[PDB]
Symmetry: T
Subunit: 170 residues, 12 copies
């Protein structure tokens, strides 16, 4: 494995998770009214688990000899996803669209990392797989709410449970 490339991938994914922890706060606060109370706890579940994803990526970055960038704006500019901005018309459907685009991008990032470390770096692969479980379940929550396609998921009992990444957490 070319380890500088994996370090770029991992830093970009961790910037995606950190920015996501911010933008989801904003999105959570605008899920308002009767429809929004339905999706608020789900946004909060995804936001806390994603910040846990950041908390799991950083130790692996420093394991491989990389560092987080000096400036937090450099970090934000490195995000592998685009910013989950609040829509101009922040309806519940428009917000769900933004959240679904974010978790679809996140699934792709971690699929890319797993397809990079498969049979080559088992620790990073296992970590990217653990985050990929939770990003797939994030995408399913928001795609069932926005489109109605049944994907059989439930709401975590408490936000930030992160059942698949917890063994990388303290």
């Amino acid at each position: 494995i070319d380890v500088e490339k994996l370090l770029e991938l991992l830093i970009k994914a961790a910037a995606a998770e950190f920015t996501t922890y911010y933008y989801y706060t904003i999105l959570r606060n605008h899920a308002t009214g009767l429809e929004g109370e339905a999706i608020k706890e789900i946004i909060e579940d995804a936001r806390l688990e994603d910040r846990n994803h950041f908390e799991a990526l950083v130790p692996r970055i420093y394991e491989l000899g990389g560092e987080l960038p000096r400036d937090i704006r450099e970090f934000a500019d490195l995000a592998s996803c685009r910013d989950a901005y609040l829509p101009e018309e922040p309806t519940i459907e428009n917000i769900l669209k933004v959240l679904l685009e974010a978790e679809r991008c996140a699934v792709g990032v971690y699929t890319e990392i797993c397809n990079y470390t498969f049979g080559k770096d088992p620790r990073t692969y296992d970590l990217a797989l653990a985050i990929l479980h939770e990003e797939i379940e994030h995408e399913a929550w928001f795609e069932e709410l926005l489109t109605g396609k049944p994907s059989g998921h439930f709401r975590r009992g408490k936000p930030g449970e992160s059942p698949y990444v917890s063994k990388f957490l303290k």
Copy 2:
């Protein structure tokens, strides 16, 4: 008490609970969208408690000298209720209709067993009464969601609590 008749009643009710544990899984997965997120945890609450009802009926069946049937298809064909099939147009209102018919039938089954063992078999009566509490509360949840008639119930804190049948559970 004619104990073969009570054994038929109890086996038929346990087949109702086992099939219900399956069909409610299917119904749970199709409660989708913004309206469905409202009723999903309630379907899950009823599904887990009903499978707990099966888990409480089987020991009493073997107490009285009966057995579950050899083949699982024989068992399913013995269900005292009709199959809670997914409706052809699986809207939230049509699904609530199916769930309400299932829990109304279940209330009738356990009313029948209690009216059979009253003053005659106190253990089976107490057990049928404990399940009857939870089936009455299932019916009330779904009738408040479908019709709006206030029956004063809340959502269990965690699915499968089964507060009335727990003392028959392990």
Copy 3:
């Protein structure tokens, strides 16, 4: 501080909390249907915390040399708020209107008590402040549900948590 005036304020506020514990029960039971399941746990959260507010006001009343009135009808007639009556047309929006008027009055009562005991009676001030936190958060829940204005609150994990008044509770 004129302590008979503070005792009137505190008794009137405790009658507001006790009556509110009753009327919110009624309002909780009529939050029915698909929209009402969304607001039921929020009504229950506010009802239990408000009865906890009564449970915190009574010890301070007897600290200052006051008593609850002999007759429970005298007590109800002393409520600093108006009765959160069930609306003639008990829709979800009309019920939210009633709940929001009740929690807006409650915020005003406890603002008045804090503006009375500020720098003068620190124990009563701290207690009125603790209740005022929870009444402000009640008002925000119901104003976000009724109007959509984002005020950034979540649902307590379990009803009656009363995180700000708990240190006055047993």
Copy 4:
């Protein structure tokens, strides 16, 4: 069963429990001195369990198609017991007399409901029986304290345990 009669009985008993939750607060605060510290926790135990009795009666009332009355004064005027007023000479013995009259009336109310729903409405019967256990134990506590007749009861570990009605509570 004539269900309007059972609804009257159940509403009157729930008004008895709600008023009792108020009047026992007052009685608790006047159990003072060296003798009163002995009976205070017992008054608190009975007060919290009785308010739990109210919390268990209301869901059954709305199950059967009844409602709590619109006005809280109507409710108080419906109490099946007389008001546990603070005695004119509020000695420990006079207060125990009042508490014993209240719990003797409560035992009679729930005996009446059980004698009404026996073999006829098993859910309401089971609920009235669960409250009747705790009202019998309330009467025994206060009759042992006032007269010395041994009835073999202990103090609940924590107030409001309600071991017999808990399965109807949330």
Copy 5:
């Protein structure tokens, strides 16, 4: 109900439970070897739950105006069962025979009490029913071990759980 007769029944049953708590200790210690390790935890489960049965009968005896007899030998001589003596040849099969005779007698005692208080004394009936659940499950454990007839019971997780009588325990 003739209450002196019910007091005799209840005192005799409580002597049965107290003596049983002793004799089961002895029987537990002689369940030795490879076969006995299988039945030891089951003997211990039944012994602790039976002593819990004594702990639940005594408060009801003093509720009804009765007392335990002055002398512990009078008490032992009042046991409604015969003494679960260690067999002359204390094999695992002979010990199981003794345990099964004891729990069959206990089922009969509590069936007799329930058939006495049915529709007449609901508190004592509920208590006798709760003990009767656990005595029926004791009989089933020992009859499955001695004869092999399937009655579908499992081993309690911890001895003395007493899931049916716990609400009468402190």
Copy 6:
């Protein structure tokens, strides 16, 4: 990956787990006598974990765009294993034979799914691997009991622990 083939494999394996949850109940109840008490908790451990396997397979099926079949008999007819029928001579050795054939088939099913999704679908692979851990340990328990070959496993502390699949459970 041809996703309809993986959906067939996953539905067939989930029917195997659901039928197994039924048939193991029956097998559990006939593990009787002194020898059977030894294997009962082990049957119960495997039965509960297998029903947990069903509870983990269904969300992945609806993730991939599949559904459980409409009718529960269709589902049972799709089981990748043969029915763990009670043997004609239900001795402890014959029952162990049936249980060992069932868990050997289950190991083969999940080996097949893992050999299908390896390096191709990491979420389904991880899930099939988690179930495969527990099916390998089921096979080892029953092969040590039936043949005596040491495979170094212990009994789970509580049934249905499912230590490897729990992160897919709620």
Copy 7:
């Protein structure tokens, strides 16, 4: 050590604890009125810990090759203490006298066993010492209540804690 003598001492002390568990039940129920509520929890604390003393003595008896006697009346007749009979005039002071005589005898029994096994049988010595701690604290509770001599003890948080003998308990 002459081990038959130590076995006599240990069997006599265990009969003292078993009879005490009975007689303290009776004494507990007659600690009535305002004064008795003060001493009831203390009687209950001593009763449960003493029955725990029986539960710790029996394993050591069977360790040393002894057995509990065949008949429970033989056992009661072997008690190293005299029977804590209910006094003819069962006042709170007379009951405290009886309880203090019982715990003074118990302190003497275990002092005798410790003075027997000192430097000779360390396991039995440690066990007799652990019971002797709790019997000394029982005597101090009852001597402070009856005479007022300060011995600095508090009430255990929950009855039957047995902090010194717990490591011999299961």
Copy 8:
């Protein structure tokens, strides 16, 4: 704020709490007999919470640049209260008099500190307020026991709970 003056106040109050932790031990041990068992747990509650007050004052003293005095006798000589000496005639009423004088002095000390840091040092003010809550509740317990004036307080569940100062404790 003149910070040396606040440091004197805080050191004097912490010496009051440390000496109080000693003298309350002595007072606790002499609350003997039937009346004293009533007040013992209340003395223990106040003693442990007061030693917790010392544990909260010391970090704030070292925050502000002060130190505890070198010698423990200097410290004791700095106590803002007078020594809660055991009365010459240590009756329950005389001991309650001493305890009430101590907690009345403590309320005055912390009122003085709060009136010093109000709007000037918010951390010390909040800390002095938290201790002042618990000292007001100490005074109320002892004034209700000694005089009978109802102040509506209960006994903490466990000694040293310190619900208001706990957030300053470790």
Copy 9:
């Protein structure tokens, strides 16, 4: 109070906390070697509590009618503190210098907010006071490590305890 000014103050302080949560991660990772292991848990304690400070500021911002800025770079540019950059020579002493400058600035920010809302906005004042407690204790930890001045603080038991702000957290 001019509420736009308080909203600026609160948004700037929340940007300080969010950036601090990032920069402290970086600082935590470079506290290396034998000296750094001493300060790592303290950096982690401060980092988690500061991110909790962000989690408490956002609900109050949306209460007062403000919002977090659309872009995360705008947010970072609004931080009331300067960026806790990793020093060019990242020794343990240089890192402690940076951490101490950050927590000294944070103490000043929250002193400014409290001096703004004192007697004017009690909810925001209480919140700013709760954060100010934890920022004062952060400054004391780092000033004791860097200079040796005794300020009497200990290490929180687990990172992110936030004992003073927890009642604002979920």
Copy 10:
């Protein structure tokens, strides 16, 4: 006490415990079949508690100025017991013979240490006594399984409880 002799005794006993932790693993894995499932948890209980014995001996060795030997083979060669080798014919009875010889030797080792430190080194004596309790109970388990002599012991609830040595453990 000659402390080099006590250090030899303690090092030899700790080598006995460490080797025993290995050999019991092997013995545990060969307790197979229907008889072996009975004794497996008992072997596991003894193995974990014995490794806990090693964990308690090492701190006392370094207290007295001794060390564990440099090489792990030197350590194994110092074991005060002989190696609990797997028997050539590893039947359940032959394995029980080996386990009983090991725990009989262990009882003798710790009897020797206690007879060495009695009245001379109280810390080491107390530690050797705590291990001696658990070794006596190990011997009793295996002697009841192999010979049937009743010694009145039960199975620890969870392996490695070590109730007597836990206060020396971390």
Copy 11:
């Protein structure tokens, strides 16, 4: 035993523990800087356990008919150790010297008490032994930190665990 001599020894040792609880607070606060953070939790562990030693000595003093002295200065003047004064040059090494002298004196005090009550007063002996365990482990912590001699101890998980004296604590 001459009990006045043992009472002197026990009162002097309890004054040593109480003064130590004060002086260790002071010593804890001056363990500053990078080296001091290493020893702070160890000082806190010893300080809390020593105050627990005081909490265990007082009940035994009042058991034997002794009392704590009337005045707290008399008590401090009775300390069996010398005052653990802050050194004139309070370096980490000088502070460790003071702490090691204090715990060496404490080991000698409790060795003296055990050598006094050996075979003569088993309760006091057991108590002095329990404190002597913890004082030996205190001495080992400080002697390993000051000199480097390996004595194999670890840091208690939480301060004031007091694993050996806890059974004397409430």
Copy 12:
């Protein structure tokens, strides 16, 4: 896969873990002084997790048809690592060198096993991967302490947590 080769690898790795559990005890005890207290808990964390690694390897060895060797010296001679001997000059830096060589060897062993079972034996691969996570984190702890290279790890909350291997543990 050639299964005898994998059995050699797994037995050699389990001997590495068992010997490591011994040698780390020795290394832990010599991490003395002010610097050593910093690294002691980290040595203890690694030692307990490594012994947990042994506890996870043995069941997989007996799954695959292998056994631990008859003699514990044969086992030690099979260790895939070299013995982590105490250095001749046991400074903190020399001890860290030894620990880092041990965990670097362990990372290589488990990398070798994973590179052997990849896509071939998924259970053993998953197990070797779980141990490899914890061995990589062991190496990072010791390399950050010895060299200062930031690898972003923290100290486990309690020793032997083994977050990655726990699902293989009981």
